[PDB]
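Limitations

Structures in this collection are predictions, not experimental determinations, and the ligand pose is part of the prediction. Treat each record accordingly. The example that follows, with cacodylate ion as the small molecule, is included so readers can see exactly what is and is not provided: the inputs are given verbatim, and the output is the predicted complex.
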Amino acid sequence: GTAGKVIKCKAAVLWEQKQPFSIEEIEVAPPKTKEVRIKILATGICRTDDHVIKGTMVSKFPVIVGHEATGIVESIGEGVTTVKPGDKVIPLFLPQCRECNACRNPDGNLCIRSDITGRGVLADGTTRFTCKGKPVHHFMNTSTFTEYTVVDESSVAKIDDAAPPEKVCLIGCGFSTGYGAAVKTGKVKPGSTCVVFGLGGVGLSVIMGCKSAGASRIIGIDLNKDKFEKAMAVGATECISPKDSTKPISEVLSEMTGNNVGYTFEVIGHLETMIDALASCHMNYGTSVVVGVPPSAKMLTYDPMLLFTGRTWKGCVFGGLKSRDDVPKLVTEFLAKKFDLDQLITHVLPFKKISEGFELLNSGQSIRTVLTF
Amino acid sequence: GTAGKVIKCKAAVLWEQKQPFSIEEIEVAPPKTKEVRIKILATGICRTDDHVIKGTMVSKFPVIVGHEATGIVESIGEGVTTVKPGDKVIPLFLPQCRECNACRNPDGNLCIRSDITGRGVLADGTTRFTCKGKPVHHFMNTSTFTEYTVVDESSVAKIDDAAPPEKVCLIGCGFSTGYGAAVKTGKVKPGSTCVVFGLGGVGLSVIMGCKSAGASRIIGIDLNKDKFEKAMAVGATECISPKDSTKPISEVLSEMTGNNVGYTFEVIGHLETMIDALASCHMNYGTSVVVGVPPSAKMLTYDPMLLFTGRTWKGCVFGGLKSRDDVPKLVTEFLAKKFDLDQLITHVLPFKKISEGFELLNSGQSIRTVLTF
Amino acid sequence: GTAGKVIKCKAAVLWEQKQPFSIEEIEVAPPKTKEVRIKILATGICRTDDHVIKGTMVSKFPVIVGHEATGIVESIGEGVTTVKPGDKVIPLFLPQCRECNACRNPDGNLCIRSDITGRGVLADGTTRFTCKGKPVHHFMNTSTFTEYTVVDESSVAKIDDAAPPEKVCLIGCGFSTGYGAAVKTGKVKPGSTCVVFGLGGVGLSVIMGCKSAGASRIIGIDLNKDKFEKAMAVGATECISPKDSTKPISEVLSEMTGNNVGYTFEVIGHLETMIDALASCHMNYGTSVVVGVPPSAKMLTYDPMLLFTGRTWKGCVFGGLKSRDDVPKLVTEFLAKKFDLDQLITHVLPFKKISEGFELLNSGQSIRTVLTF
Amino acid sequence: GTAGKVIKCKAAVLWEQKQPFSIEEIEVAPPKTKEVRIKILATGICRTDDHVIKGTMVSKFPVIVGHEATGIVESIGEGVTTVKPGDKVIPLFLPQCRECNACRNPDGNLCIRSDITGRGVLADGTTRFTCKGKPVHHFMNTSTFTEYTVVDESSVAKIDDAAPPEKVCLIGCGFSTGYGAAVKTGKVKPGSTCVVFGLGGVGLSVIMGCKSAGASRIIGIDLNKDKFEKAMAVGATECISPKDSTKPISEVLSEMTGNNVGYTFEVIGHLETMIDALASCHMNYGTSVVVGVPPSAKMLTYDPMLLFTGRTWKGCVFGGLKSRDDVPKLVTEFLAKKFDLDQLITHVLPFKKISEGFELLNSGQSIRTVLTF
Ligand SMILES: NC(=O)c1ccc[n+]([C@@H]2O[C@H](COP(=O)([O-])OP(=O)(O)OC[C@H]3O[C@@H](n4cnc5c(N)ncnc54)[C@H](O)[C@@H]3O)[C@@H](O)[C@H]2O)c1
Ligand SMILES: NC(=O)c1ccc[n+]([C@@H]2O[C@H](COP(=O)([O-])OP(=O)(O)OC[C@H]3O[C@@H](n4cnc5c(N)ncnc54)[C@H](O)[C@@H]3O)[C@@H](O)[C@H]2O)c1
Ligand SMILES: NC(=O)c1ccc[n+]([C@@H]2O[C@H](COP(=O)([O-])OP(=O)(O)OC[C@H]3O[C@@H](n4cnc5c(N)ncnc54)[C@H](O)[C@@H]3O)[C@@H](O)[C@H]2O)c1
Ligand SMILES: NC(=O)c1ccc[n+]([C@@H]2O[C@H](COP(=O)([O-])OP(=O)(O)OC[C@H]3O[C@@H](n4cnc5c(N)ncnc54)[C@H](O)[C@@H]3O)[C@@H](O)[C@H]2O)c1
Ligand SMILES: C[As](C)(=O)[O-]
Ligand SMILES: C[As](C)(=O)[O-]
Ligand SMILES: C[As](C)(=O)[O-]
Ligand SMILES: C[As](C)(=O)[O-]
Ligand SMILES: C[As](C)(=O)[O-]
Ligand SMILES: [Zn+2]
Ligand SMILES: [Zn+2]
Ligand SMILES: [Zn+2]
Ligand SMILES: [Zn+2]
Ligand SMILES: [Zn+2]
Ligand SMILES: [Zn+2]
Ligand SMILES: [Zn+2]
Ligand SMILES: [Zn+2]
Ligand SMILES: [Zn+2]
Ligand SMILES: [Zn+2]
Ligand SMILES: [Zn+2]
Ligand SMILES: [Zn+2]
Ligand SMILES: [Zn+2]
Ligand SMILES: [Zn+2]
Ligand SMILES: [Zn+2]
Ligand SMILES: [Zn+2]
Ligand SMILES: [Zn+2]
Ligand SMILES: [Zn+2]
Ligand SMILES: [Zn+2]
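Predicted complex:
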């Protein structure tokens, strides 16, 4: 009965920077050509969502953040072919137009439609959200902290009907990012020695990926020792903290492996720890993968000799996945009991408790928090 | 015979930094255990040698430089098994002891015996040169600006007897580095687009590597437009200079290619161009290889965001070659007519005209000058 | 912690003879009085371990083989006084209780505690391993193809901490055996002419021993001519194959040396070659050392006149070394670069690739393959 | 004079095997170049001579046996420089030409001129004896069961004129063999425990040798207990017989010494007891010397594991003595009263009674029986 009509629903709106959410009553426009309106079933709280709140990430306001989620297709726009009302799907912050260079290349995944600049809009350059007359912006081609959202078709992944929305939502960000980091970006090898900087939802996902890649050793690092128990239990053959010693973490790690660190992953978001992760992989054959999003407008300064000796330094976006291709496959892999997401979800709460949720994340008391509708 | 005795010969000595070469009469101690004394037949003037003079490369003094050469074995020390007197060889600055992690690693090449710290001695920590009752240091496990030198066996490659020493000496640094940079370090896929920053002896070699890789486009970049004719002769599809436009080189290249720069190579040695090279490759699926040697003790400041999107940034030592295995294979490939080295040799002069060789190097009027004995 | 507790870990188990390994999850009991639980860091693949598989060496089943290794002391049992947790150690397949006759005799080394009969248990007659509720047998007082093992204190050699595990593990069997076979058992004298039958890990170590002793001539013998290059490199003066001539190898050797073969060494494990080795040393003043292990339950038949004329024929266990006395000394000698172990190691692979190590051995492609944990 | 003329005398000839002696009239040709004709004063009856009669030793017929003797030089052939007519000498069945590997090598003694193949001729391939027209063959470079014999100068030891020929004749075989077996071949050590298999003439000499080495225990073994009284008188500390118990002799011996049998000597001539002798010495640090002579054309089958554990097994020819150097010295030591030979001679008879001497040998009634002229 709503298809074609504006949908009045609620949404955690953010009117300005460094402000708390405001659960407003908003109006969601119907989907235009090649767009899709989705009803969010569950959505997790990712650390990147907090970046906007903190103001460590450029964004227009007002805006509805949230990007990690599972939903149902309420209605499809004109010309859509990959989905139909009733289909279970997962909104993709990383699209796959399949037409641009990065999409045409098997070794690329950052679609030209990727909202990196903080555009806060869809393909045609407009918004679909209105609240109190004034228009509300989108977040990374998704916007999930709402009962309903509209994303372009190029940002819709049709998944298996039987998939549990409250768990598979991690495939929309957190999990796929860390797992694919190892498996598809760093391409960790069997017998390797990996080092993961940061033991959050993504960090812990990298571990699973490395352990699954065959790494005979996986060392976890975190200032928060409370994250160790989770680490060891996930695949960390050990875990330490930078504060445990005064000698550079790079030296410590070398000594621990006898200078044979094949991979280092930065999954925090600190420039200082990016240098640390680089310096910690082997000087000639080590690879350092940066997964953590660095704070906007900050220049990095390091010793270029660290790179000259042969080191490989690369970035990662959504764990190197080709969204529309890989997401539905990973879902089937979860159904086939291959991976246990449950280890990652430390809290399931009703959407209304969103404020409490963000509190948890920021206190170091939680991995993932899944909000329910 | 000369075997077992100290050899008196002439060598181009550098008594201190920022001073011309002094062609002194020196004493070359005989080869100890697993060492090899070599008679130099032909040696190339490489830019890195100039770094010692200019003072931008750490080195002890006095010292004898030169590291690109072809020689003949005069006498082997005790225990030597890979070479015998009269054998044609190429001394190696990048050793291959076959037993350290890097040598054992199929993805490594920086042997632990590499003199990266400017020690200026052999494996046992001593020198073999003397001049006026003063010990003269070695340079990067080689020292070829001399009638005779002594290296460790791990630093000797036995090559085909019929190899013209005045041509294949480039296989000791110049040509191997460039060619390998493209084929081994960068793994240039066929049909891709490559951009090379710097059209000197190594830069031109990189063009040959990309050309051997099947690249559909290879764009040369140099401030000296006189280098352009050569670049085109060895395989460049077109050449340009940064001064030709006011907009950033990264944007000029993106526009020229439709946002498709597969691989960039920094073949100059300026941190400035290292960032330009990084920034000039596709933001998500591009690879930038640092071939140029950055000036001593200089930190590099760049925008981390260039990396995070997915760019791969990696160093390169000797073209990623495992010295003792690859050098012989390259000489065989030269004799098998797989490539031309004549194009890179602009001048062939007697060893005594070494200062002119350096003049032509610095005045930009020479790719490779080869000094003969 | 793990002290006093059962350890769950992985181990390559053999359930019956003529079967491939089965990496299984096993439990390792804590150490009882005067025993020591050790974590394995690196372990070699010695041909003896292959005899168990092939069934040419008696063993009870199931069993965990492997015996050439380096480790770190996880925990010590009651009354232990020679090692402490943290200590680096080499487990000893040849004990040294220091109380028995062979231990008190300066010319003996086969301690009563040696497991030569396939006992597969510790000094108190019991096992320390369980897998699927059923007890698993030890191998030659060691058992190292497991993450953890328990040995009697009489079978632990505390070594230098700075010792690289993946190198000094050969001092646990292979190197010490062939080396001591020349220096300690055969007592090769300066100027002699030695002959080695078999050029694998042990054979190559014999040649190093002969050279170290002062042999003027070392002849290598092997069907696999691909082994010649390394035999020559390590010390040989020439190598040949039994197939090169139709006349008995003894005659050939007589002819090459003009009937002056002082020492022959059988480092293979064939009754046939044991005889060949005997008949090849001088008929009156020759010495023939048997290093290779004869297939179990096979009687030897030879011409006694070979012996009567004066030939000395003697067996050899662990190169004649007194375990806890000579092992620690060899590690220290190694650290002083007295001998090269890396020449013997042709492959380093992660433990999980155990079959490939064995396949490489059996296909004639490796000397020593070292497995890392 | 007789010098230069054929000498007619008597000799004990064997026309064929398994037939008693025949005292015939024979012709002894004059000594050719580098040969010596000797008058036999006294000669012992060695068990080896009986081997020829029994047919368990290869020989041509007819032949004149006997090899243990003392004599006087009748005439010297052309070129002879070491002895003159009238000199007292001992014919050597083991030559010392001083120009062959064994001879020149300090550890060898089996000269190249030794008659091991059972030729029965002198260096030049001819005989010197004639009887009833037909030529009679020599035995082991000696032939002493005759009044006159001719030997090569390499088989002649000039000894002290004051030496009792009826006692020192044992130094031509029996005594020197047994004595040297312990002192020179086995190299028995002070305080060791030796076991001698066979209490005959050579066995008793081994005991004497072991007693001079400082042995602490010397256990004698024989099936004939009447030999025990003499064994104890020459040095044995106890004696036993294989039939004294049912358990294997090796266990009996082990039990008696607490598994500490340093040396075993076989001085009987059986393959079975040679095996018993090996198995009887300490499995790791024991040495078993084979002195007895094994019946020709018989293969020995034993368990190689007996040898593998470390036992040293060696043969013995004439107690390992360099005949021309050692025989004189031994006589000199006898005259210096180092040992008593009288204990070994149980019967002194005239040469015509040779048959009785042999009867007493094969009945067990005598140790050595000396025949006089
Ligand atoms: N690249 C992308 O595709 C992508 C995807 C998802 C998330 N992210 C980014 O990855 C990073 C983490 O994601 P998350 O959900 O796992 O965050 P998270 O907050 O749950 O985990 C952060 C971890 O870093 C640890 N940490 C902080 N400072 C530390 C330090 N100095 N040294 C060691 N550990 C320290 C914290 O204790 C915590 O364990 C953030 O920058 C996020 O924006 C990026
Ligand atoms: N990685 C190694 O293994 C290795 C091996 C060989 C040489 N090198 C280094 O590689 C670099 C080049 O070697 P080369 O012998 O070919 O030097 P070269 O002097 O012949 O070439 C340098 C080129 O760079 C050009 N150039 C300089 N500044 C420029 C700028 N700002 N922009 C564009 N072009 C500019 C010059 O005109 C010249 O053509 C040096 O740093 C040398 O030390 C490294
Ligand atoms: N005595 C002990 O203390 C002790 C110690 C270690 C090893 N071993 C024994 O030593 C022997 C060899 O061990 P390894 O570790 O050196 O093994 P290995 O397999 O690496 O070497 C065997 C070598 O002998 C060669 N060979 C095989 N058949 C041949 C033949 N018919 N004639 C000539 N050469 C032939 C093989 O090609 C190979 O080169 C084995 O029996 C092993 O059990 C004994
Ligand atoms: N190697 C040489 O240089 C050399 C020198 C002299 C003698 N021999 C040989 O040495 C051996 C001994 O010579 P001998 O002159 O002293 O002989 P012998 O006949 O006097 O003594 C043999 C002894 O062995 C004992 N015996 C035989 N079978 C027995 C058995 N099964 N178990 C235990 N005892 C048994 C006999 O009772 C006798 O006491 C002979 O074979 C002889 O040919 C060798
Ligand atoms: C069960 As069964 C034949 O291995 O004893
Ligand atoms: C010795 As079984 C466990 O194979 O019967
Ligand atoms: C034949 As079985 C040792 O497995 O019982
Ligand atoms: C008798 As014993 C324990 O030394 O072999
Ligand atoms: C004659 As005695 C050495 O046995 O006492
Ligand atoms: Zn996210
Ligand atoms: Zn796209
Ligand atoms: Zn932090
Ligand atoms: Zn190396
Ligand atoms: Zn100096
Ligand atoms: Zn160079
Ligand atoms: Zn420049
Ligand atoms: Zn010119
Ligand atoms: Zn079974
Ligand atoms: Zn072994
Ligand atoms: Zn059992
Ligand atoms: Zn012992
Ligand atoms: Zn074989
Ligand atoms: Zn080495
Ligand atoms: Zn001789
Ligand atoms: Zn004849
Ligand atoms: Zn005799
Ligand atoms: Zn008998
Ligand atoms: Zn009688």
